[PDB]
């Protein structure tokens, strides 16, 4: 049948249960699972080729200037590196 208004507000893939009460998020990654006992019980192992796309937005402070400078110089192709930069004037 035709996709009416009432059929876009009810159901599993509707809006109230498909895109409001739970919604797809950015900055995620899905992978198969392998054991690693030599890792502490609070530590998950992220592969090298997954951490190069997943990123954390760190704001420069007076305490982490040199570290972020080195991360920016290292670039988006070597693992301890940076992938995007955003400024206040921009």
């Amino acid at each position: 049948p035709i996709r009416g208004f009432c059929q876009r507000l009810k159901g599993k893939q509707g809006r109230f249960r498909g895109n409001l009460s739970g919604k797809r998020v950015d900055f995620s990654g899905r992978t198969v699972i392998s054991p690693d006992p030599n890792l502490s019980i609070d530590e998950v192992a992220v592969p090298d080729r997954v951490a190069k796309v997943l990123t954390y937005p760190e704001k420069v402070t007076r305490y982490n200037r040199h570290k972020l400078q080195e991360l920016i110089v290292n670039g988006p192709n070597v693992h301890p590196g940076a992938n995007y930069l955003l400024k206040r004037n921009e």
Binding site: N19, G22, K23, V25, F27, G29, R30, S34, P35
Partner: protein, 500 residues
């Protein structure tokens, strides 16, 4: 009396006066090559029965279980197993869920598909480089012609807890076994382009190879070739062109009686190899279709290697992923000098009733030592005592429990280890097609949220159950970040006197 067509039947051997109607002489005629099953039908030795007819008859299983009150005899018991379940070695010793999982799993095995696979172009194909027939096979394998075109490899398996890396049905491969050619599988994919002729008598042109001012091929077209179709044999990486297509710039037809004879330029609409690891072109084929157009097919291939994540099965279920890849020096070894290839956890046997795998190991060891393929057909096959006698005759333990030496410290293992050849399959569910990462990417035009699927650079769902679980901790800021800040944030203007 039923005369309908569409009923299911089975052939049995009529038995009367306490004697099977097929004597040894009729079996001799069959084994001589004459008196086909049709002839035994005509003489009245075998009869077709449906479940309606079996309701009043009396069927016997073995010859030893004859009573005068029977009417029929089952021709062989292992008819009860199907064709897909026929590969399972000694499945009457296993548990029923194991057989069910093997039936659902063996259809995803990687092996050679047919004798004509390298002239075949399918949408997806997996071929094992070094196939091997199963050492403990079944009469079903000889009948349905499975050993001739196998799928899987015979790995020497030690059943021991090598490290913590091999817990919860995981597996430990050998680095000097993968690199010698174990589980080396190659994958083939197809790319099809049809150069449609539009109503304006304008059609796609494959021509052109871009060259910069330096006079050399550009990096985007390093394997494009002279005509416009990527050359067979050349490597193709992420972000290159192997069919440099071009479509007419006048997308709308609008049939024109005007001249417009020349300067009907084309725009670039190529196919771009945006795969994540390198692939090689192995076939490029061109054809003329039924409507007399141009059809171009390209077969890409990549020779992946076993690593962490790939699945493995044992023909008794017991699926699992590789957990670690240890070097040959760290693996155990025996008096002869052999190291195992795959080590499995002994915690998969108590909870899964997988005694058939153990009997398979002993039968396979007896077979490789004796020199003959050993049957393991269901309800019968080859017994255990004779294989034990062969194992002691060649000079081994009766239960395959050979004494090993731990390569890490050179000491004798304080407990014996189950050691022998087991046949394993490499399944198609591999890590390299399931890795995923999102970051910031494409958005749907109706909801402005992340899209779905790894074929569109999508993200992961955070369903209602996960939302409730995050509520269950008291995490407010995290929920606000997950579902508003980084999912579908939007700046709106609201009039706080009316409210719209």
């Amino acid at each position: 009396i039923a005369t309908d067509g569409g009923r299911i039947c089975r052939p049995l051997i009529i038995v009367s006066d306490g004697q099977s109607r097929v004597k040894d002489i009729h079996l001799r005629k069959l084994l001589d090559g004459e008196l086909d099953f049709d002839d035994f039908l005509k003489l009245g030795l075998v009869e077709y029965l449906d479940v309606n007819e079996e309701n009043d008859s009396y069927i016997a299983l073995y010859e030893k279980d004859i009573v005068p009150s029977m009417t029929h005899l089952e021709i062989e018991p292992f008819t009860i197993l199907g064709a897909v379940a026929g590969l399972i070695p000694y499945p009457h010793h296993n548990q029923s869920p194991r057989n069910t999982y093997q039936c659902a799993m063996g259809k995803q095995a990687i092996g050679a598909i047919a004798y004509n696979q390298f002239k075949r172009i399918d949408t997806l194909l997996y071929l094992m480089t070094y196939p091997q027939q199963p050492m403990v096979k079944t009469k079903t394998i000889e009948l349905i012609d499975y050993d001739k075109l196998p799928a899987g490899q015979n790995a020497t398996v030690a059943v021991m807890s090598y490290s913590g890396y091999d817990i919860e049905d995981a597996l430990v491969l050998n680095k000097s076994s993968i690199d010698r050619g174990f589980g080396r599988c190659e994958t083939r994919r197809k790319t099809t382009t049809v150069l449609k002729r539009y109503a304006n008598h304008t059609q796609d042109i494959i021509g052109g190879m871009r060259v910069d001012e330096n006079g050399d091929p550009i990096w985007q077209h390093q394997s494009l070739g002279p005509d416009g179709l990527g050359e067979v044999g050349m490597k193709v990486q992420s972000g290159q062109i192997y069919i440099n297509k071009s479509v007419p710039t006048n997308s709308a037809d609008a049939p024109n009686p005007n001249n417009v004879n020349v300067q009907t330029q084309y725009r670039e609409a190529p196919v771009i190899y945006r795969g994540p690891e390198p692939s090689h072109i192995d076939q490029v084929m061109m054809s003329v279709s039924d409507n007399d157009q141009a059809l171009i097919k390209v077969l890409l291939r990549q020779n992946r290697r076993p690593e962490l994540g790939d699945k493995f099965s044992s023909r008794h279920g017991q699926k699992g992923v590789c957990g670690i890849i240890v070097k040959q020096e760290d693996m155990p070894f025996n008096d002869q000098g052999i190291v195992p290839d795959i080590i499995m956890n002994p915690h998969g046997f108590p909870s899964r009733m997988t005694v058939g795998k153990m009997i398979e190991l002993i039968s396979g060891k007896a077979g490789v030592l004796n020199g003959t393929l050993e049957y393991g057909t269901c309800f019968g096959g080859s017994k255990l005592e004779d294989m034990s006698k062969i194992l002691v005759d060649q000079g081994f333990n009766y239960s395959g429990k050979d004494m090993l030496y731990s390569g890490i410290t050179g000491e004798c293992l304080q407990a014996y280890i189950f050691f022998g050849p087991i046949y394993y399959q490499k399944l198609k569910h591999m890590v390299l097609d399931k890795m995923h990462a999102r970051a910031r990417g494409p958005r749907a035009v109706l909801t402005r949220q992340p899209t779905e699927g790894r074929s569109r650079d999508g993200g992961l769902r955070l369903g209602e159950m996960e939302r409730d679980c995050v509520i269950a901790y008291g995490a407010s800021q995290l929920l606000l970040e997950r579902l508003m800040i980084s999912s579908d944030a939007f700046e709106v203007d609201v009039c706080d006197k009316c409210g719209l």
